From TrEMBL, chains A, B:
It comes from the Bacteria. One of its GO terms (molecular function) is serine-type endopeptidase activity. The lineage of its organism: Bacteria, Bacillati, Bacillota, Bacilli, Bacillales. InterPro entries: 6-blade_b-propeller_TolB-like (IPR011042), AB_hydrolase_fold (IPR029058), Peptidase_S9_cat (IPR001375). This is Amino acyl peptidase. Residues 389-594 form the Peptidase S9 prolyl oligopeptidase catalytic domain. It holds the Pfam family Peptidase_S9. PANTHER family: DIPEPTIDYL PEPTIDASE FAMILY MEMBER 6, SERINE PEPTIDASE S9 FAMILY MEMBER. One of its GO terms (biological process) is proteolysis. Gene3D superfamilies: alpha/beta hydrolase, Prolyl oligopeptidase, N-terminal domain, TolB, C-terminal domain. Keywords: Hydrolase, Protease.
Amino acid sequence: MINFPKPTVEQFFRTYTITNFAVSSDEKRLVFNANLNGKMNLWAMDLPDTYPYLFAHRDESCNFIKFDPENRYVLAGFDKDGDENYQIYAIPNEGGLPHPLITGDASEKYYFSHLSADGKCVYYETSKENPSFLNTRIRNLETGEDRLLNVGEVSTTELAAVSENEESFVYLRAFANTYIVGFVKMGEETFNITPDPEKVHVAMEPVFTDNETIYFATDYDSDEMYLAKFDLTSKEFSKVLAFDGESIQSVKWDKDNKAFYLITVKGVTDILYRYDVATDKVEECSLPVDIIEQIQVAKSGNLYILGRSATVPHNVYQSSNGVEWKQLTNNRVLGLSPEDMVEPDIVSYTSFDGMEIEALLFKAKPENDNGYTIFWPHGGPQSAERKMFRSMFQCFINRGYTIFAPNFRGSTGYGSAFTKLVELDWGEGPRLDCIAGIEWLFESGFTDRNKLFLVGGSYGGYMALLLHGRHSDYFRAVVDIFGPSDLFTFINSVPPHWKPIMERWLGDPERDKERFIKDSPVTYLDGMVKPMLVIQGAKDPRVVKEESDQIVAKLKEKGRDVEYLVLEDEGHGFSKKENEIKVYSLMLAFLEKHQALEHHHHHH
Amino acid sequence: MINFPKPTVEQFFRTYTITNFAVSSDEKRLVFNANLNGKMNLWAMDLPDTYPYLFAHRDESCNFIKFDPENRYVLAGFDKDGDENYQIYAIPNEGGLPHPLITGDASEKYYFSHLSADGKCVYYETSKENPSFLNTRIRNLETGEDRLLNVGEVSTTELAAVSENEESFVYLRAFANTYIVGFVKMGEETFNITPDPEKVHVAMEPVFTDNETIYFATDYDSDEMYLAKFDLTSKEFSKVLAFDGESIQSVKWDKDNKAFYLITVKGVTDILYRYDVATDKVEECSLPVDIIEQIQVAKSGNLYILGRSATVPHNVYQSSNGVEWKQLTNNRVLGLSPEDMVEPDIVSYTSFDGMEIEALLFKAKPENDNGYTIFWPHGGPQSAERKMFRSMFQCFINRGYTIFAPNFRGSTGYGSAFTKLVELDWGEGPRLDCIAGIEWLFESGFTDRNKLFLVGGSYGGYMALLLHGRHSDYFRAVVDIFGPSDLFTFINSVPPHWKPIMERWLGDPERDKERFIKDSPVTYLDGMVKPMLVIQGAKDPRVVKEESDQIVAKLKEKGRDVEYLVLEDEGHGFSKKENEIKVYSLMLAFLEKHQALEHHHHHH
């Protein structure tokens, strides 16, 4: 009847992000962090009523939310403008204004570790007197007394679990993202929790089941993360449950049912399992989305997840049995449904050394298809592109782009060994996996030559710059979103507590000088001749602004076609809607103007 | 445990407004207009799910919302930055971007009147060819055809109801706010719906129950508005149902139960009644709030309202039967409950001629009380101050102010005769009502001399200016929010279609020269010695910018303490949160600094 034009990119601009949530011990309140009003703030629902209200006002990113078990307060962590100098604040149980609780100087960090079961004692890590390795302290909220509990040594040390009786403590000590050693502290004495800490492995997600037992996730002597157990009395490590070709990334003790909920990564999706300890039996549950951001188990055995799909934005869901899910939030893409968006095809190709590489290909719909492709290397590097909603992707797909995102070596979800391959090799193997995937796109016919764009953020921004420098001929245009450009400057500018990890992840500036030169994008500045858009957040602590200033500066001396957008109030990401939309709008205009006119004149 | 500071002012800044709403015919969608994300936009709930999602993006005020009966579209009307040039847009059933439907030049107005029961034909009013009186047209959505239906004559005329068979039409013609004459057009002939249209009276809210029958509210030969019926065949007018000391202001036909829902005004609250036509019986319903803003009756008989109370913000409720209400939305004040806010005491005093004047007194809480009082003349003037939420009041009360809001002569809610007393008397009767209220405050002890601020908006702002001009000694400082300052400029600057009403409401600038001067604030410019803040929206069509510009320009010539805030992107109100907050912040800081220093030195 009325002729409504088809959807435009502006419809994809009004979707918000939910980063995080928590559920009160009695399940009467669920609080979540979302930029529903244009900036990050905590919102609440009085379950079962799902109409949300503002729970606290702050307009900052939030790193954790914790209910008092006796409902006298809510704790949350907030930084400044993407600072990542998170500190700990308290909020009245009914909401209100955050109140400084465990805070200090603007450059200090205060991370929440554990809350005592009586709600009196907060365990946390701080960088204050120990920037490199962090100290572990306790604040007693009744008396105000604050104690040193553990002094970090050797590498970055955090407190990851505490026994009901507050006599036993599990620490995790990170030497790399793939080498994380667990130890228990009991007397003055300490104990490894795997059989051999000299073996490269991760221990994650420890939980006390007794004052004398922990279970946790580890890939000790395996290519996948499995469920292990450690007995503090006998000091016995045991392998309990493993999944063929899947890594456990989440362990949740359902105490009253003596059961675990376990999330695994199987490539580009997450799977949920229930494990009944007593009957040693495993139920395969069903998730309503493909990618889980967070999960919580209430005392009653109810299950709460935060997750998303390719075609479904961040939403929170509730289940009793882990099989039928009530969707609680209703975060949608304006006027559309999953059918209106594109699911990616999972696809694979063979790389230079015979290694099979899995990738996500999002084909533009014929009706929208503009003939161009965006090659998107994900950020990390020890991360992944997965069936996870980014309004960014579907926005570009709406404008008609095909998108290709390969999980180059270094990506997670393909076992421990695959993930280690980017270590000490940021610019050889992964780059060649990308070139190989580009060649595959041409062979496939889903990309035409001279119609390939290149877009990437963070590590992907570095890869965008690196591919630009050394393989310019492939690309029509490049977008670099906070990409490190020089490895010597970058490894010196990361936060101190990342420094001990950087020797194993990246390398050493003096010992590995030659590799560092060869993998730094600024070394190939002369080869960066295609039009380029650079985007950076001034407050970024991971990839500091200087990495984007220097590369833009060096290009501008050579009179190059470079655009540069700085967002004064953001860090490693865009928590404010205004800024997010500004970035989308600019990337779209940039890519549009660098398509070829290809104007056809017909018989008229 | 944790020492939380007491509620601050900034907690009243995060509350949003809901101005208007509609429910689909099948009750499976409810759409409403709100500035929950900082600007006005349509949000929606898939009932019984109440988690809302964005339905249309526009960032503009919305004057109506209308579902298609066959669920192929939603109509809505938007202006530009508080222009009040509303025009008609269509939105897909699922939501999306509004599409120009019945629109034109930026200065033109297109007001929706009626949609045909098949969803084919849209009746509307436009200023285009008849700015003073308006014309009524019809648009066929299947064909694109647009016919002229009626030409406004004599005074400003709208189509208020259309029969099921589209052969009879009720028009309303307004000569004053208290004088609105109804007539019916069938064939080419027209009849009065009241016996004598020479009697000053109002007819309102007509509804066709048959193609031969209408009911409506009117106050013909009465001091209150009552339910009335007019039979189109026999041309019989009947007085059907009246409520002692209450005026009907809304009339809703529940067709399947042959029943009426009627809302009355009884001073400072609204009351809901059900009237069963078959049995001539009245059932008194209960409301979950004191002031109703809008009401729809679904075909199933279910009841939907939007409203508020002194301590409960705008919210939407639903009922099977008008007794037990389900609150659908959760618009709250951040971290607070009703009990944390102040209910006004209902008070009354005798005025200069013995007339009784009702008033709302908000007493500051002992623990907050700063000892000052704010005197607030409401806007309109043929409006009222009522037990209605304004985040503004509770914000000032929290900071420690007592607030007094009298319903001076001209106010609604105390019968037709009372409402007319402001007509041709803006600056005398009501001015003296205010003075008597101020004298009563002093005598009651609830306000001290030298501790009285004055704050008003619209007609309230005119009154603020006048009270300042002729009576400055009563006041520490004054806030004028978009108030007319000079009656000569004002009456010439109002919108074209408001002009016909203006001779009866205000008067004639030649015939009434003397009174216009006596009642213009700007003739008492010399008496405005107290410090004053002035607030104006640039796009305001009711009280144009020039009314505030000129009074500020004149006070500045005499070196007076005047502050002026213009909001470039607002009209006669603050639809955008950023502006509303700037206004509150500035008012609070203005009133603080013009309190007396009151420093107390202690023995320490």
